[PDB]
Ligand binder design. Structure first.
Ligand SMILES: Nc1nc2c([C@@H]3N[C@H](CO)C[C@H]3O)c[nH]c2c(=O)[nH]1
Ligand SMILES: Nc1nc2c([C@@H]3N[C@H](CO)C[C@H]3O)c[nH]c2c(=O)[nH]1
Ligand SMILES: [Zn+2]
Ligand SMILES: [Zn+2]
Lengths: 362, 362
């Protein structure tokens, strides 16, 4: 079992499909990572997360470093053992969220003090498989001079992340490290950032600082020039994205990995994803609808329960409502990724994207 | 498959163990019925309820008759289809809860008007397997004259329940009807009530009007003379009871069936049942405890996750916390019932009760 091996099996335009082999399992790409806020993917057992097709989850670090604490989780055997997920876990670096949810210096972020060295050690203690570099959160909007300052600090922090990771033998031998490109919406800064990260060298490269309110057109415009700046032979990870159409468009532009809270969070709020677009199951029109949430979905929820029942559960505030909506939405996201992988493999992803959009927005 | 066949396989003192065969499945007795408030056993899929060992669940009618409504549930295919539980369901009659949570007349309860005929029709529409007679809620405490009035109205309502049930062919042929003994804490009224119910004739007999604040000593004193008043050859159902020690003591006094919200409700509130007594998992003493909730429990929760993890989930307000606590508590209740059945079968229930109490209250 390799530490980290990315292999591209097929291409179509800028889109790629393939695999990342790691010690704890294989990740099929393009990949969607369910988000686990506080050592749980909300309302799902890990076996259910796996049953939906997920190969890897994202563990939020910002929450866990406070309570229970990274040292405590390590004492209890690590995050995998703690939460009962034995496959790869990507951990975010914590500083971004802290600033997003503070006082910044060259040393790190104060809120307690979080430094790039401390971030890597926390992720080490959690037993992370994919470690993110410690980066800074750029405000949006931001002046070129302001985005440049943040990006450059992030690049210096990326070097320190690299060194801290490399100094930890167990981590360097068993885990992978991703750098995070910054530079807001500006092409020249995205280039300098890419250049800096490539000079350092990482196992994978994330596009950070997007989905911060710029809108899809702008996000896509930024991806258009930003993704080709990254090393072609390494995975490309778009952080915090997104809606199904965001994902399809991002894959068309060379992205291999995704995470976002939308399927879980909007699931609990009554929004279900379908191939004909999102529906809100609380709507009165579903009160006697015996069809499943989606007519084609292969998930366990759509095999057994009706829209009418789930409508009732969510309106009654029942936990099982949240459970069923969440399992379906995560499964829908995984079936989307599977359709993306198959269509790229088969050289018909362009047609899939067109067919998908025509029906989803009909 | 029989409509309703109760067979006693073994006795020990007043305790009995055996089976109720019904069209939708076999019920092992003594039986515990998880409570499903609004067409869900809170935080559990039906498959998980079954996995814990439950043979039958209780469906609360008071909630369902309002929303979604009994007619609507019938239009959608019945309660079994609606919620995805294909085994027996006992439905309560609704009037008791309405008064407990009103204006009473000979016709029924106004809050809308709920009559014994309407109650049976509602339970018919839900597709109930065990239909409860429509009874009145006696206040506690209550004067002999006051408990007598309520009990007598309940007995007249029991006759009307019987007639409404018998007039519905599909119901009479496929379902069972239980009468409910009332009479508060008074022996002579319990006798008159038993006599009245026996004169009418039912498939099973419930002891109603207990666990209303009288305390365990008094409840047991009432059961002491009340249960022998019921037909020996029919099941005895103690409604709304209870804590594990309540159950053991009630079986010692001839009870065959139980329901209560304690394992589900107190599960969500952080209380876990163990053979060494209840624990509150939120307590700081569990924060680094790697043991399962209970050292012997065979449930899926205790096979995989630690006290420390569940402590974290409940303190974080995570849905998975409620899910895991609830599955364990329901499983614990079922393992309790299994131990009760086996020990009666083997003629060592007296010793089991003593051993159970010595350890549970140690
Ligand atoms: N380190 C870091 N993390 C993120 C994220 C992560 N994505 C999660 C889902 O939006 C939230 C946060 O954990 C979005 N953008 C960034 C980003 O630019 N940097
Ligand atoms: N019809 C009826 N129902 C009950 C109950 C039921 N038991 C549930 C759990 O306490 C609540 C309610 O549905 C308790 N006591 C009685 C009772 O005496 N009568
Ligand atoms: Zn589905
Ligand atoms: Zn257990």
């Amino acid at each position: 079992r390799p530490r980290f091996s990315f292999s591209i099996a097929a291409r179509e335009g800028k889109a790629r499909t393939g695999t990342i082999e790691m010690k704890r399992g294989v990740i099929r790409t393009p990949a969607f990572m369910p988000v686990g806020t506080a050592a749980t993917v909300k309302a799902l057992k890990p076996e259910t997360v796996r049953a939906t097709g997920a190969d890897i989850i994202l563990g939020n670090t910002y929450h866990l470093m406070l309570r229970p604490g990274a040292e405590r989780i390590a004492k209890l055997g690590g995050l995998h053992s703690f939460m009962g997920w034995d496959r790869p876990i990507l951990t975010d670096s914590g500083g971004y969220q802290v600033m997003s949810l503070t006082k910044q210096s060259e040393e790190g972020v104060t809120f307690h003090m979080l430094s790039p060295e401390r971030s890597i050690e926390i992720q080490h203690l959690l037993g992370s498989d994919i470690v993110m570099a410690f980066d800074e959160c750029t405000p949006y909007p931001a002046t070129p001079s302001r985005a440049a300052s943040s990006m450059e600090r992030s690049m210096r922090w990326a070097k320190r992340s690299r060194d801290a990771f490399d100094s930890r033998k167990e981590q360097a031998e068993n885990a992978a490290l991703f750098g995070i490109q910054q530079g807001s919406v500006f092409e020249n800064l995205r280039q300098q950032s890419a250049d800096a990260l490539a000079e350092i060298g990482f196992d994978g490269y994330a596009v950070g600082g997007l989905a911060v309110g710029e809108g899809q057109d702008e996000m896509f415009r930024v991806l258009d020039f930003s993704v080709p700046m990254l090393p072609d032979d390494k995975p490309h990870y778009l952080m915090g994205v997104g809606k199904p159409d965001d994902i399809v468009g991002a894959v068309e532009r060379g992205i291999d990995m995704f995470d976002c809270v939308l399927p879980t969070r909007s699931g609990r709020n009554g929004q279900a994803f379908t191939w004909d677009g999102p529906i809100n199951i609380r709507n009165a029109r579903f009160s006697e609808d015996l069809k499943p949430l989606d007519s084609e979905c292969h998930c366990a929820v759509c095999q057994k329960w009706s829209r009418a029942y789930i409508h009732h559960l969510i309106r009654a505030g029942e936990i099982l409502g949240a459970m069923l909506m969440t399992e379906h939405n995560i499964a829908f996201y995984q079936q989307l990724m599977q359709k993306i992988r198959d269509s790229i493999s088969e050289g018909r992803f362009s047609q899939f994207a067109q067919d998908f959009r025509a029906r989803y927005f009909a």
